[PDB]
Amino acid sequence: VQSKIGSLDNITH
Amino acid sequence: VQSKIGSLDNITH
Amino acid sequence: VQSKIGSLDNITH
Amino acid sequence: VQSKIGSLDNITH
Amino acid sequence: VQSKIGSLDNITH
Amino acid sequence: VQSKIGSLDNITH
Amino acid sequence: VQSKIGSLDNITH
Amino acid sequence: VQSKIGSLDNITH
Amino acid sequence: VQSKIGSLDNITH
Amino acid sequence: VQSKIGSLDNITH
Amino acid sequence: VQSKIGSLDNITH
Amino acid sequence: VQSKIGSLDNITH
Amino acid sequence: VQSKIGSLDNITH
Amino acid sequence: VQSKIGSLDNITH
Amino acid sequence: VQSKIGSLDNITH
Amino acid sequence: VQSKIGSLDNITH
Amino acid sequence: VQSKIGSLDNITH
Amino acid sequence: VQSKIGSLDNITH
């Protein structure tokens, strides 16, 4: 409800 | 409800 | 509810 | 049983 | 049983 | 039983 | 809800 | 909710 | 909620 | 669920 | 759930 | 849940 | 949502 | 949500 | 939420 | 759910 | 749930 | 839940 997600996982090899 | 998703996974090899 | 997530995991090899 | 309501799953391997 | 209502699944391999 | 309501799961391996 | 399960295995990666 | 389960294994990585 | 489980194993990594 | 009502009797004069 | 009501009786005169 | 009501009786004159 | 689900109504006048 | 779920109503006048 | 869940109402006048 | 109600009058006899 | 109600009057006899 | 109510009057006889 009126929320945001930018990123959950940022997996950089 | 009135929410946003920008990105979940950003997997860069 | 009116919350934000910037990032959960930042896994840099 | 083994159900979901309003959930978010981000499964990565 | 083994059902979903209003969910988001992001499964990556 | 073994259910979810409004949850977020981020499982990484 | 009436449910019967003989055996349940949840494996997540 | 009435539930019956013989055996339950949850393995998470 | 009425529940019956014979054996329950939760393994988390 | 697995319930009983011995008699549902509503009389108005 | 597995309950009883011996008699549901509502009389109005 | 596994409960009883011996008699539900409401009379109005 | 905004419904009458699994209910019993006994209205007398 | 905003519902009547699994309820019994016995209204007399 | 804002509901009547698993309730019994016995209203007489 | 995005509900709007102007006015709700409920009388039970 | 995003509910709005102007005024709620409830009378029970 | 994001609820708004202007005024709630409740009378029980």
Author numbering:
A (entry chain L), B (entry chain R), C (entry chain F), D (entry chain K), E (entry chain Q), F (entry chain E), ...: 350 to 362
What does the paper say about this structure?
Functional tau is most abundant in neuronal axons where it binds to microtubules, assists microtubule assembly, and is essential for the structural integrity of neurons and for axonal transport. Here, we identify a new amyloidogenic segment, PAM4 (Polymorphic AMyloid segment in repeat 4), encompassing residues 350–362 of R4, and show that it self-assembles into amyloid fibrils. Cryo-EM revealed that PAM4 fibrils are highly polymorphic, and, remarkably, that the polymorphs formed by this segment in isolation recapitulate the conformations that PAM4 adopts in polymorphs from different human tauopathies. In all cases, the folds share a C-terminal β-strand (residues 358–362) but differ in the way they orientate the N-terminus about an intermediary GS-bend (residues 355–356).
Two-dimensional (2D) classification revealed that this peptide batch also formed multiple fibril polymorphs, with three distinct PAM4 fibril structures that could be determined to high resolution. The most abundant polymorph, PAM4 Type 2 (representing 28% of the total population), was resolved to a resolution of 2.8 Å. This polymorph has six peptide subunits per layer with a helical twist and rise of 358.55° and 4.8 Å, respectively, corresponding to a crossover distance of 60 nm. The resolution of the maps, in combination with liquid chromatography-mass spectrometry (LCMS) data, facilitated the identification of an adduct coming from a minor population of the peptide containing an N-terminal Fmoc protection group from peptide synthesis (~7.4%). Similarly, stacked protected N-termini pack at the protofibril interfaces of each of the three fibril structures with the C-termini extending towards the anterior fibril surface, which could potentially explain the additional structural morphologies resolved in the presence of the Fmoc protection group. Interestingly, the folds were interchangeable within the different fibril types, with Type 1 contaning FoldA and B, Type 2 fibrils containing FoldB, C and D, and Type 3 and Type 4 fibrils containing FoldC and D. FoldB PAM4, which has a flipped N-terminal compared to the previous fold, perfectly matches the 4R PSP-derived tau fibril cores and shows a C-terminal mismatch to the 3R PiD tau polymorph. Finally, FoldD PAM4 matches R2:R3:R4 (4R) tau strains that are associated with corticobasal degeneration (CBD) and argyrophilic grain disease (AGD). Specifically, the FoldC conformation of PAM4 stabilised by the K353-D358 salt-bridge is also found in tau C-fold protofilament polymorphs linked to Alzheimer’s disease (AD), Gerstmann-Sträussler-Scheinker (GSS), primary age-related tauopathy (PART) and cerebral amyloid angiopathy (CAA), while showing reasonable fit to chronic traumatic encephalopathy (CTE) polymorphs.
